[PDB]
Write a protein that binds this ligand. Structure first.
Ligand code: HEM
Lengths: 95, 95
């Protein structure tokens, strides 16, 4: 796969924001430890983490989630976004 | 997104077979109604369905799963592959 350039990041974030916004809000809630998330957007994803813009009652906040293991290409990014969505759905059941 | 040409199909199937083989076996079990699936591969995906090659004890069999609604582009393909994986994991619990 292609390495995680800012160009590739932009395209990943664009597609997540348009077609996977529910998953991003799950990331913000479970991995970002944010309580009453209204919506969340991905601003960037890079080898070591992702930057989320998170909306709630108190307005907007930017947070960073750091990955346990650095991403080496867009396939690593795919696998982590899949795994994080599954893990967040499991955790979000119990609050 | 790009329309579902055989070229795009080839690339989707290639990536599913290399990085999502577990999901394909779930498709074969739940949507293909195949019992003791050893492994499954995607041979083609087109606007109306997907062709799976499915290995079991009795050897190899090709099956077709037809989509309720035809796919119009690669994003539709993405959404159906995601949904089918989630649905198969739910069903596969109860046998
Ligand atoms: C050849 C291209 C692609 C294929 C074949 C593909 C296939 C899949 C499959 C099978 C899943 C379900 C995984 C599972 O539940 O086991 C999935 C999930 C996902 N993919 Fe892709 N994908 C592709 C490209 C992309 C791209 C370009 C992005 C983002 C920029 C992306 C983002 C995601 C996300 C976020 C999920 C999880 C969605 C959710 O949990 O609701 N995928 N993909």
């Amino acid at each position: 796969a292609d390495p995680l350039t800012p160009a590739i990041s932009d395209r990943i974030c664009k597609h997540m924001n348009e077609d996977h916004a529910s998953a991003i809000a799950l990331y913000a809630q479970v991995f970002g430890q944010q309580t009453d998330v209204t919506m969340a957007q991905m601003q960037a994803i890079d080898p070591t983490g992702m930057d989320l813009v998170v909306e709630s009652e108190g307005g907007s906040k930017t947070i960073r989630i750091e990955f346990e293991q650095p991403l080496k290409d867009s396939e690593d990014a795919h696998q982590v976004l899949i795994a994080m969505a599954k893990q967040a759905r499991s955790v979000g059941k119990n609050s």
